[PDB]
Nucleic acid binder design. Structure first.
Length: 92
DNA sequence: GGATGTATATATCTGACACGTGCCTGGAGACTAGGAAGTAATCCCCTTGGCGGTTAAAACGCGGGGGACAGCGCGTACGTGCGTTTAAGCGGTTGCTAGAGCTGTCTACGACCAATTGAGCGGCCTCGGCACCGGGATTCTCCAGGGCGGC
């Protein structure tokens, strides 16, 4: 009961590299990275909601936080990823 | 004798004080639930002062040469100044649209709560692969017999 991100990072690793392992320190670094990106995007979306006098955080605020924080092709590819995930989640 | 410098008085300009009003946001009073303080138990990590042994890192000394720094020359590129151009800055036209603010209505979306159950965490059993032990096949070193030579 430690509430980590290790199993999902492991499944993503088996998606991109099915025959590659990962050490415990590298897994801790990946968990810290996911937590850092989560709190950056959530803080930017919270600030965006407060700037526009909105009481809710929607996918638009998350999208704007992604386009604000992520640079270059990372931003547009993450927008395409999140957009098609939201489209798949809505239709079904 | 005429006009100029200077002092006191009066009207006007301007920042500041108080009065008035709305309104809406903070304060007063009451109630309630849960966040956090406190308590006890268990277990593992950290503290302080020691010992022993390995060993690789740290320290010290010394020679030498590479590099930092100073000086000098030179030539070029930037500062300085002036005359000319040009465009910024201001004021102005003329319509339309974007956007803030306010009011109003409504609806879909998210909070909330109860029941459920299935994905996450731990252990247990098994397989894939690596490794330990016993047995069979192949090649290397050696001891002895036969033949020849000498007195």
């Amino acid at each position: 009961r430690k509430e980590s991100y290790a199993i999902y990072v492991y499944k993503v690793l088996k998606q991109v590299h099915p025959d590659t392992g990962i050490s415990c320190k590298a897994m801790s670094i990946m968990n810290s990275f996911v937590n850092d990106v989560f709190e950056r995007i959530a803080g930017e979306a919270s600030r965006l909601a407060h700037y526009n006098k909105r009481s809710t955080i929607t996918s638009r605020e998350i999208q704007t936080a992604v386009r604000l924080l992520l640079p270059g092709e990372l931003a547009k590819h993450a927008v395409s990823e999140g957009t098609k995930a939201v489209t798949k989640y809505t239709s079904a």
